[PDB]
Structure formats: C-alpha cells, structure tokens
From Swiss-Prot, chain A:
Forms the muzzle assembly at the distal part of the tail. May serve as the gatekeeper to control the ejection of the cargo proteins. It is found in: Virion. It comes from the Viruses. This is Muzzle protein. Homohexamer. It comes from Bacteroides phage crAss001 (Bacteroides phage PhiCrAss001). The chain holds residues 2 to 147 of 1371 of the full protein.
UniProtKB/Swiss-Prot annotation, chains C, D, E, F:
The barrel is composed of five stacked dodecameric ring structures. Rings 4 and 5 are both composed of gp34. Podoviridae-like phages usually possess only one such ring. The tail is thus rather long. It comes from Bacteroides phage crAss001 (Bacteroides phage PhiCrAss001). Signal peptide: none annotated. This is Ring protein 4/5. GO terms for cellular component: virion component. Homododecamer. It is found in: Virion.
C-alpha cells in the first residue's frame, strides 16, 4: 500500500483521547502480562497462567469443607487463619504441605460475625507455642486466638 | 495487521493457532472475522515466513466498505477454549493515507 | 480454469503469493475486476494497435483461437413491426442480435444472388450518392445504422430491382461475466451484468491467463490509489 | 450495466464508502462524473484525433458499434412560421431536431431528385459564389447555419428552378444523462441535464466500461485537486 | 445545463468533489470565471491554431455545431447621418450590428448583381490601388474599416457605375454572460457585462462541458496564485 | 526433470523453506506458478516476436524441439448432430479436438484430392466473395470459425461440386499442468486446470530450465507486490 | 478550517450536526456563516470521509 | 492552496500578543472541558 505503523505494548493506558493515543500502549487488555514471568517475555504480551486447586485435607486425611462466606485471612508464618461465616461462625488453620492444606477447625460456634463487618488482623510469632492472631471487627470486641 | 506471535504447548511450537478474532471498529463502523487459516484457499489470516498477516474486517452494515477513518480501535483476542502460552511481540498495521 | 481457480490464483498473484500482505479483495470485487479484465482483453486483442504485437482478430493462429468461442452466426430479423423513417429510399430496416459485441462479416441473400455487405461510412455514403448511378457494385451491398431503440437497427441498401430474402451476420458474441461465488449470499443485490450467480468464462482457456493477469494488474492499480497508475492502466481499457 | 451496477463498480474501482455516516462519495457526484465521462467519451471517439488509435466514427467495427445506439434519422421542419432574413436569396430555412449532437449525413428530396447536402464552409461560400454560375453541382446541395433561437436553423441553398419537398437528417442523438438514483429523494432541486429521475445509459454496453473508467479517472483527478491534473484531464474534454 | 447546474457542478470539480477542501468561490466569482471561460472557448475554437485539433469554425461537424447558436444574419445600415470623411472616393459607409463578435460572410446587392465582399488588408489595398484600373473583379467588392464611434463602420468599395441596395452580414453573435444568481441580492452593483440578473448560456449544450472545464482550470490557476500558472493559462485567453 | 526435482531446484533458486513450521512457499503456489510459467513460455516461443531472438515455432532447431512433445495430429469430426446455421451455403461444420491450443496445419481429403486449408480472415472473406467465381484456388480450401459451444467449430468452405471425406488437423496440444504434489492431500478441493493429482511435465527437457526460471521470476515479482513489476512481467504473458 | 469532531446522543453518532457558527475576524475584518450542510448544493460546511 | 497549520488545545491562554500566540492553546473558550471526564476525552475539547 502506502504507509505503515508499528505498535509496541509498554503497558495499558486509558483516559486519553483516541485522536491523541500513544501507539506504545494498549487501550484495553484482558488476561495478559507484559512483565517476564516464568519465561523471558518482558515487554512482549503474554498469557496468564491459570490456577490449580489445593485440596483441604484434615490431618486424618479426610476432606474439610469450609462453611461459607470468608470475612478475612491471616498468614502468620506458614499458617493461614480464615474467619468464615455460614451456618456457624468458624475459624480455620491451614498449613501448606507439599500438595495439600492440612486444615484444622480451631473453633465452630457463635462468635457474633457479620458480612457487613469483615475482619482485619495482626499476627505475631513469639515462639513455637505462642503464635497469636489479633483481629477486630467494626462491630464486636477485639479478640485474640492462639 | 501484520504481527509476530507464537503459541506453545509444553515446549512444543504450534504454527497454526495464534488468535481467534479481530474486532476493528470506530465511531461509525464495526467489523469482525474469526481469523481462520486455510492453506489452499484464501482466509482472513495467513502466515508466511514466520509472520502473521490478517486482513482487517469490513463493516457489518454493508459488508463491502473497508474500515476508513482517521483512527480506529484494533483488538486481537482468543475466544476459543485452549491452554497455550501465546507470546505476542508486536503488530504492524498497514494503511493507505 | 473453473471460477474457483480464477479466485484461488488471483491470491497467488495479487495477495503477495497468498501471504495476506496486500490489501485483500472480496469475491464481488474479484468478479468485477475479472469481468472488466476480460472486456479489456477482448477489446485490445481485437484492434491490432491495442495489443503489443500489432495483430488483430485473424492476424495469427493465436488470435484465431482467442476469439474462437465468441464467434457466432445469427440472422437479422426484418423490423417491419415499427414503421420508422429511413434515411435511404430503398433501405430495409433489419434488427441485429441482442448479444452482439462486434460485427466481422455480413451477407445478404437476394433474388439476384448473395452479396457481401460493406459497412459504409458517413463520408463514403455522401461521396457515392453524389454520382449518376448511386448503387453498389454488382457483388456488394451497403449498410448504415439507423434509429435504434434498445437494440441495433441497420439499413440494408441493396440495389434497386432486388429483394432481400435473408441477412446473415457473423459477429463476436458479448462475453458473459466471470463470477466466483453466489453474490446474493453475502452481498445484497449486486449484479455484474444482471446475473447474481456463479458464471464461468465463455472463452477458450488460452486467454484465461491473460485475463487473470490483467485482473491482477487492475486490482493493484485500483489499490495503489495513485492517479498516475489509474490513468496509465486506463489507456488499455479500449 | 444498469444504474445500480454503475454505482457499484464505481464504488469498487474508486474505494468509496456506501455508508452515509461517513459521507463518502455520494450518488449525485457520481452521476455528475459519469455524465461528464460519457460526453467526453462520445466527443473523443467521434473525432479520430481525440482517441489513442486515430479512428473516428466509422473507422473500425468497434467505433460503428459505439455510436450505434445514438444514430437517429429525423426530418427537418420548415421554419416558415418566423419571417426572418436569410443570407442567400434562394435559401429555405429549416429547423433541426432539438436533441441534436452531431450531423453525419443530410439529404434533400427535390422535384429533380434526391440531392446530398454538403455543409459548405464560410470560406467556400465566398469562393464558389465569386464565379459565374453560383449553383451547386448537379447532385448536391449546400447548407449554412443561420439565425437560430434555442435550436439550430439551417439555410438550404439548393439550385434555383427547384423546390424542396423533404430534408432528412441522420445525426448522433444527444446522450441522456447517467443518473444512479432519484436525485429529488435526498437532493432537493438538483439536476444533471434537466432530469432528476433514474436515467439508464442509452449507449451500447461496449462503451460502458470506457465510461466507468473515464469517470473514475475524473473522480481521482478532481479529488486530488492539483491544477496540473485538472489541466491534463481537461485536454480530454473535447 | 441550466445555470444552477453550472454552479452545482463547478463544486464537483473545483471544490475537491464538493468537499470544501479547496478555497471556495462566491457565485459572483463563478459567474465571472464562466463568462471569461466562454469567451476563451469561443476564441480558441474559432482560430484553428488556438485549439488542440488544429480545426477552426467549419473544419469539422463538431465545430459546426459549436458555433451553431451564435451565427446571426443581419443587415448593415447606411451611415448617412454623420457626414464623415472616407479614405476612398467611392466608399459608402455602413454601420454593422452592435452585437457583433466575428464576421464570416458579407455580401452586397448591387444593381448589377450580388457581389461577395472580400475584407481587404491594408497591404493589398495599397497593392491593388497602384494599378491602372483600380476596381475589384466582376463578382466581388472590397471592404475596409473606417472612423468608428462606439460601433463598427465599414467602407464598401464597390465598382464605380454601380449602386449599393443591400448589405448582408453573417457573423458570430457576441455571447451573453453566464450568471448563476441575482448578483444584486448580495453584491451591491456588480455586473458581468451590464446585466445583474440570472443569465443562461446562449450556446449549444455540446460545449457546456468545455466551458465548465475551462472555468474550473481558470479558478484553480487564479487561486494557486503562482505567476507561472497565471501566465501559462493566459496563453489560451486568445 | 520430474515433479520432485521441479520443487527441489525451485526451492534452491528461490530460497524458500521446506519446513511447514514456517509456512515458507508451499507446493500449491509453486505448482500454480510453474503452470503459469509453462503457458507463458509456450505462448512467447510460438510467436516469434514474443521472445528475444525473434524466432517462432519452426525458425530454428531449438524451437522445433521445444514444441515437439506438443505436436498432435487429429481428425475433425462432423457436427451434423446439431442443425445449426452456417455463414456460407457450402460450409460443412466440423468440430475440432478439445485439447487444442494452436492449429499449425490443416488439410481436407476430397474426391478431387487432398487440399490444404487456408484460414481465411474476415476481411479476405468479403474481398474474395465480392468477385465472379467465389471459390478457392484449385489446390486449397478455406476455413472460418463459426458458432461454437464449449469447443471450436469450423466451417470448411471447399469448392462446390466436391465432397469432404477427411479433415486432418495438426495442432499444438494444450500443455498439461505442472503439479508438484497431490493437492487433495493438504489442500481440500483446489485444482490447477481441473487436475488434483501429480502432473509430470509433458514437454521436452530442453525447456524445463526455461520454465523453472520463468516460474522463479514470477514468484519473485509476485512476492514483491510492486505494481510496476507486475505490469512488466505481465507483458510476457502473451 | 479543516477539523475533526463528533457529536453523540446517548451512544448514537450524529454525522450531521457539529457546529453552528464560525466567527473569523481581525483588526479590520469580521465575517460569519451559520455552517449549514446541504448534501446536494454547496454550503459553508461540508463533510467527507 | 500552499500551506497549512494544525491547532491543538492544551489549555486556555490569554494576555499574549496576537502576533506571538501559541497554536497549542485557545484564546478564549466557553463551556468546554479539556480533561477526560465521563469519557476518555483528554487533550480533546469536549462539552460541559
């Protein structure tokens, strides 16, 4: 024909008039990655690798089904602490083993919990036995759990 | 839309599948083709000497008018189920001014 | 070459060896360009000065085989239905075939005998009608075109004292369009010359390569969009 | 090709947009260009020097078929209604047809007999009227144009002692415009040659491609707007 | 083409296919350019050397139809009102028509008989008046232009012993202006040639395309503003 | 060279990639180009002016060997099945072979004897049929093509009072396509001249190199895509 | 005055109405036109491509 | 014609001599917005 134009993708840009858009950016992108991840594909558009489910096996090996809606998490060192609502108001402790999460149910009762008041937590490691997780709702008293 | 790109499947190159649609539109036009590649017959998408080249679609309203405007949005995408890593380096657009 | 071959091989030539490197033509556009190319090829290879060899219809074996499948022989029908006015007193109006492109031989069968028709120009008519006798030679008849409505009407000026019993016309038939797909399937009501369906080439395969190459050149010129290219390849439209 | 086709392959060969959101190249402008192209083609093909081959109206079979749909034979009507003044004593004023483009043959039927008309130039009138006899040759008559009002009036200088009974004129009819669509639909009160409705081409299909190519060239050269292109493609307006 | 068609079609050619891409001309400017273009076209197609074909007024059928609606026949009126002084003893001063552009045939009706007038140059007059007899040939008369006031005055030097009873002049009438609107409506007191209202073309439609194209070329040159373009297209002003 | 070789030295002289991971230049496109090259070579070498030496079919030993594998002798079959209309009273319609490219010798065996056929042009038919006798010379017969349907039909105008027994035709057979590989294997329903299988070249090995070089030139010029190259290498398509 | 511009009406393009006046002036001149667009006739404002 | 000039609108500027004005700015504007608001019309003049 007559003319050409080359387009590189340094990022994703919006908010700019179409007449004055910059060819170095993409106007809109779905499920792409421009940084080199798992391969040397930096400054080159590349895919998003998917997720892989991790079974929640109890220490005895049986499956552990989580009750309901999650309100907040907390990773202390390698223990993930979930505060979930549902039929009851539960607390879990998940430790990542090689291929599964060794799930424990630290509590299952009526800690008044609401979905309108999610959880925010701080967790400290004092020693092998005193591993605390302080958490607060916007509604209820501040609480602690070892 | 001349563009370099490569799809892989566990260290195996796949020289037949890169993209599955090309929506091109502006304030008064919108066209789209599936980007098929038939070796013998002409097709929207053709590869040769390791470069892909896709004919930009034509307007849905008439199915004859080319995408003629001062600017235009160019959108490449895959919408068919698949599990490949598709490195997409860059794309040149050939126009007539 | 079937129509499918004309379409597939247009892209081995127009589209940078089927690389989708050039602009990309629909099938309607390819059909239009092929029809125009065949008309151009016929017109150029008819006139000796229109081609590169200086050779016309019957000037070489190749030219004879080129127009072999267009040459048709048909009879003219007396136009006695319409009582029009003729420029010559002894002119019998005859209507020619509808699918007529170029006439190359005409003959009239009179009571006196067959007489080869000479298509006489407007200057020769005035020159030959300024003389005492004002009749053709013993073995010929004249022909001038007259008031024509959606057809071709010819005045046959044969010598007086003679009656016309027949009128044979050998001519080049109008070529049919080249269409590579059912146009109505994707394009609403587009016709090339009034036909919306697949139409093959009614020509000898010898000039199919010529027609395809001319179509490719026309496509490349129409897409380069230069005025200079358009006017340059417009020279060969005649 | 019909009007819809003319528009369609004009779009194909020019790369315009049929949509109205982008105005593109609309139907009025295409009709104007196709008209101008058809008068240009007629003028260039009638004059042998106007084309590339050097062949005029009846200089080859193609040219005979080109003007075939335009040839018309009509009589001249006496202009005795208006008592004007003639430049010759023995001149009978006759009015020519209104839709007249070019006269190629004229003949007058007198009591002495049919006599071919010679359109005599202004120089030859003085030259032949500066002699003793001052009458045409036995089998010819003269013709010089005279005072005309919204028509063409011609003085028929036939030999004295003779009367004119008929005056036949074989002429090339004025081409009708090529109008792709009813202009009044969108374009309020525009016209092309006084017509506003759909006007199919009145010519043989053989020159439809020539007209389309010439119209495309004119479109490209006008859209470019360069003075140089305008002057070069104005040379082919005659 | 009505005036409305000349204006609308100027913009399909001057204004980059009616795209408002070129400068933009008022209707007064378009009228001025059309009038100048028609004067230029008349002057060029009259002189054979002024056009591209080398053909003058009566050198082809096209030229005959071009000037068909300008040719007028009028009588000269004896200029006995003003007792001026003539360069020749036997010269009868005659005034010519006011709307006169170019003379092509003149005749004088004497008691001896009609005599074709030869417009004699100033060199031939001195050459022929250095001889014994000093009279025209038996079938001709001379003509030289004399003192003229706001008109055209001609001395008719016919042979002595003869009286002039008539003087017929066949000439090209001065074309009327081309005006596309009532100029007084928006432009105060501007006239093209003394007329402020809509004025149609008094010419055959055959040269309307020529006039429009010349107007477009003149507009493009006058707006490109180059001295070179102006002097180049000023060549064709004659 | 066989098909595998044609592909292999095409790859060597063009620098394509045999691998399919990079598509490279595939076998269908190479077959198409080799075909087009072989018809181009045949057409250019038959016409003396088409090549660089100025030597035609039988103008040197090389040219005689070039077309040697294409020369075929076959008889024409009477077309009495269809009761069509002939342009001559004494014309017997004969059908020619289907795989016909160019006719170089024709002869008819009559009761009087074998008579060489002269393919008589459309002008010479009128010229020789405007004479008293209107029959060929003693040892020749005429031939003019007539109405043909998906074949070539020829009118054999032999002298009256004679009957036609045989009609031999020595002609150049239509070349078969050069197909490097079975197209149906990968390419669904593509064809080259109605063939899909492997088609070895039917020509002498002497012009195999010419065909390969021409195909390589066409490949390079098409892949370049320049209009100028396409027009220049289209000149050698005839 | 060549210019690109677009008028919308709730996600609907309007290819007929962009501007309604153009006042151009300097120390000694002042002109103004309404910027109408008549498809057939010449007008102060014309759109194409 | 002969020459052209392109005008962008990065803002509204005044107070500068007309001979030395900058084509990138507008001398005076009424009810316009040059920042992208409710649409991606940044550095393009748009309505209020």
């Amino acid at each position: 024909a007559l003319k050409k134009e080359q387009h590189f993708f340094k990022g994703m840009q919006r908010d700019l008039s179409v007449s004055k858009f910059n060819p170095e950016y993409a106007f809109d992108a779905q499920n792409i990655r421009i940084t080199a991840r798992e391969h040397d594909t930096l400054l080159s558009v590349s895919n998003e690798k998917g997720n892989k489910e991790i079974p929640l096996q109890s220490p005895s090996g049986d499956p552990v089904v989580i009750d309901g809606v999650l309100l907040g998490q907390n990773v202390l060192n390698n223990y993930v602490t979930l505060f979930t609502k549902g039929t009851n108001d539960n607390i879990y402790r998940l430790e990542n083993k090689g291929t599964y999460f060794e799930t424990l149910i630290l509590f299952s009762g009526n800690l008044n919990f609401s979905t309108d008041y999610p959880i925010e937590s701080i967790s400290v490691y004092e020693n092998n036995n005193i591993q605390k997780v302080y958490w607060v709702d916007g509604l209820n008293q501040a609480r602690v759990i070892n | 839309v001349e563009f370099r790109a490569d799809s892989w499947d566990s260290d195996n190159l796949i020289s037949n599948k890169t993209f599955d649609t090309l929506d091109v539109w502006n304030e008064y036009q919108h066209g789209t083709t599936p980007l098929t590649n038939l070796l013998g017959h002409p097709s929207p998408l053709k590869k040769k000497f390791r470069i892909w080249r896709a004919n930009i679609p034509r307007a849905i309203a008439n199915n004859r008018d080319r995408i003629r405007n001062t600017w235009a949005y160019i959108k490449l995408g895959m919408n068919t189920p698949n599990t490949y890593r598709t490195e997409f380096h860059d794309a040149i657009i050939h126009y007539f001014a | 070459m079937n129509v499918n071959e004309f379409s597939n091989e247009f892209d081995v030539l127009y589209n940078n060896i089927m690389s989708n490197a050039a602009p990309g033509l629909n099938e309607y556009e390819k059909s239009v360009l092929l029809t125009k190319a065949q008309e151009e090829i016929v017109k150029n290879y008819f006139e000796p000065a229109g081609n590169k060899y200086g050779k016309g219809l019957d000037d070489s074996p190749k030219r004879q085989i080129d127009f072999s499948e267009l040459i048709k022989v048909g009879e003219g029908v007396l136009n006695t239905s319409a009582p029009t006015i003729t420029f010559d007193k002894r002119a019998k109006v005859y209507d020619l075939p509808a699918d007529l492109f170029l006439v190359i031989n005409e003959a009239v069968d009179t009571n006196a005998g067959t007489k080869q028709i000479v298509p006489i120009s407007y200057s020769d008519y005035t020159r030959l009608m300024s003389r005492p006798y004002k009749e053709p030679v013993k073995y010929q008849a004249w022909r001038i075109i007259t008031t024509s409505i959606n057809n071709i009407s010819v005045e046959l000026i044969v010598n007086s004292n003679e009656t016309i019993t027949d009128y044979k016309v050998r001519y080049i038939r109008r070529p049919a369009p080249i269409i590579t797909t059912n146009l109505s399937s994707e394009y609403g009501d587009v016709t090339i010359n009034g036909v919306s369906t697949v139409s093959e080439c009614e020509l000898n395969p010898i000039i199919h390569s010529e027609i395809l190459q001319r179509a490719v050149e026309l496509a490349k010129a129409a897409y380069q969009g230069d005025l200079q290219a358009s006017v340059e390849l417009g020279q060969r439209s005649e």
